[PDB]
């Protein structure tokens, strides 16, 4: 009876693993599972081009995973661990801004990013709530990152094996509970975008 | 600047209201917000064509809307209100089945659904969690509803005048805490699809 068994690819298995960790992040209330998913988001694309299984079904599945792990999960983790009337306001504006970001990503292509990508935007928020324990600072930073996600500031995507790797060991360090390296590297990636937008 | 303002439309505004509702359904943990979320999804697309402001961005955003409203929200709702190791395995399979069936819907342009639609599958699950206070029974149906989503059962989609109205009149009674008519219409839709498939 099942038909999509003929359209699933080996790369789609990894995206499914990415959705589990992103969903388990919500159910388990653990910031660590997002960092694992940020990696998963970085490899399932590499896998597809390495295994040759580039599918529009898997391309859609890639963004749906980003909706779960990088849109809903950072917003839920923001509110649940910082219960506030204002954090409620902030989580919605974030998770929406991420949803607008991915909707534009679907109508565009792999050329690059129009605004701060949602895996980076998610990493910024999640890492900030781990290090900064205050309702306001993370609620105000989520508004800032959400604006930078629906931004027009151009962002360069370069899936170098070494590039993906240097982000990976930074995220593996974050899986333990040492995300300061992931914080620095993405915030430097974010401030590299703003200067380039002003003038290359 | 924010150049999404030129591609944004009135049809996306209700789509955004749908994401807020399905999002608030997660954080505030009340099944009534999904019943209002099924109304938006059954309306925002109708709103688009009535004003002629359909769009791929809104088409993608409509899919992103159903990812959290009818995938992450019902899975989290099933778990958080029936916190079981047992219920965790079911919530994941329901979410991934919804994510898989949403990846298939995005790549197809048919006047129906190849599986049980994710707006109806979410109605069935949370409707059963509302009426049945049992960790186990809700969990097996979540698995069963999951398989129906990733099925080949051809389902009808005639978003006309009264079919939405009838479905959505019952969906308002679903909000107030009377989901029996919403479930009755939803469960009839489920079996009618499988009896139609059995007919073939
Ligand atoms: Ca990816
Ligand atoms: Ca819709
Ligand atoms: Cl983009
Ligand atoms: Cl993104
Ligand atoms: Cl479909
Ligand atoms: Cl659907």
UniProtKB/Swiss-Prot annotation, chains A, B:
Any one cellular-component term (Gene Ontology): plasma membrane
Residues spanning the membrane: 19-39, 57-77, 88-108, 112-132, 133-153, 162-182
Top-rank lineage group of the source organism: Archaea
Main location as per UniProt: membrane
EC number: 2.7.8.8
GO BP annotations listed: phospholipid biosynthetic process
Topology within the bilayer: Multi-pass membrane protein
Keywords of the record: Cell membrane, Lipid biosynthesis, Lipid metabolism, Membrane, Phospholipid biosynthesis, Phospholipid metabolism, Transferase, Transmembrane, Transmembrane helix
Hydrolase among keywords: no
Enzyme class: transferase
Subcellular location: Cell membrane
A molecular function (GO) term: CDP-diacylglycerol-serine O-phosphatidyltransferase activity
Entry-linked Pfam families: CDP-OH_P_transf
Family annotation (InterPro entries): CDP-alcohol_PTase-I, CDP-diaglyc--ser_O-PTrfase, CDP-OH_P_trans, CDP-OH_PTrfase_TM_dom, CDP_ALCOHOL_P_TRANSF_CS
Catalytic activity: a CDP-1,2-diacyl-sn-glycerol + L-serine = a 1,2-diacyl-sn-glycero-3-phospho-L-serine + CMP + H(+)
Keyword Isomerase: no
UniProt-listed PANTHER family: CDP-DIACYLGLYCEROL--GLYCEROL-3-PHOSPHATE 3-PHOSPHATIDYLTRANSFERASE-RELATED, CDP-DIACYLGLYCEROL--SERINE O-PHOSPHATIDYLTRANSFERASE
Family statement: Belongs to the CDP-alcohol phosphatidyltransferase class-I family.
Name this polypeptide is given: CDP-diacylglycerol--serine O-phosphatidyltransferase
Source organism phylogeny: Archaea, Methanobacteriati, Methanobacteriota, Methanomada group, Methanococci
């Amino acid at each position: 009876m099942f038909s999509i068994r003929k359209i699933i690819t080996i790369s789609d298995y990894v995206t499914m693993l990415n959705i589990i960790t992103g969903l388990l992040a919500i159910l388990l209330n653990s910031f660590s599972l997002i960092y694992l998913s940020i990696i998963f988001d970085s490899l399932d694309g590499y896998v597809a081009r390495k295994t040759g299984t580039v599918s529009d079904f898997g391309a859609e599945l890639d963004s749906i995973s980003d909706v779960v792990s990088f849109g809903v999960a950072p917003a839920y983790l923001l509110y649940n661990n910082f219960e506030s009337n204002l954090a409620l306001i902030s989580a919605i504006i974030f998770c929406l801004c991420g949803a607008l970001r991915l909707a534009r990503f679907g109508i565009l292509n792999v050329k690059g990013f129009i605004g701060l990508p949602i895996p980076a935007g998610a990493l910024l928020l999640v890492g900030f709530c781990q290090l900064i324990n205050s309702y306001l600072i993370n609620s105000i930073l989520a508004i800032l990152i959400g604006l930078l996600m629906i931004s027009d500031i151009k962002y360069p995507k370069y899936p170098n094996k070494i590039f993906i790797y240097i982000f990976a060991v930074s995220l593996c360090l974050a899986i333990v509970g040492i995300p300061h390296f992931a914080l620095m590297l993405c915030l430097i990636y974010a401030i590299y975008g703003i200067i380039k937008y002003i003038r290359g």
